[PDB]
Amino acid sequence: GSHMAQARSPWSDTATADAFIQNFLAAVSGSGAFTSDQLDDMSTIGDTIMSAMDKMARSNKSSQHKLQALNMAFASSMAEIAAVEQGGMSMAVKTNAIVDGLNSAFYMTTGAANPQFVNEMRSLISMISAASANEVSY
């Protein structure tokens, strides 16, 4: 095919990543599902993610591992944060509220939804919670 015609990760460019986080957080906050305190916890991660992008961009190039690392870093942050809300018989709300922001973020950034990647993101979060692993060191 002359054209790839495939979804492009925002981590590809810092400009795209910045916009993604901006609208992403706005969508999550807009839902009102999480308070300012909880939003801040999932907001500060945006700055950290961008910082890493600049640090890596200084001496690095487009790599599958690099892209995965960024995705895992964000998923891990959400998992550790969601741990606080962990509990109850329902969990398709606290996660859906934040995840839903991903769909809105993609549209705002471009205008097309990407459920193929959204479902994967949710799975990554679950993998983190399942792993748990209580570090005796800390």
Experimental determination technique: NMR
- What residue ranges do the domains of the chain occupy? 14-138
Please calculate the CA angle 121-122-125 and round it to the nearest 5 degrees: 90
Structure letter (DSSP) for residue 6: -
Q: Pick the closest to residue 78 from 96, 59, 52 (CA basis).
A: 96
Tell me if 45 sits within 8 A of 74, measured CB to CB.
yes
CA–CA gap between residue 120 and residue 118 (Å, rounded): 5
Helix (H, G, I), strand (E, B) or coil at 45: helix
95 CB-contact burial (10 Å; exposed 0-12 / middle 13-18 / buried 19+): buried
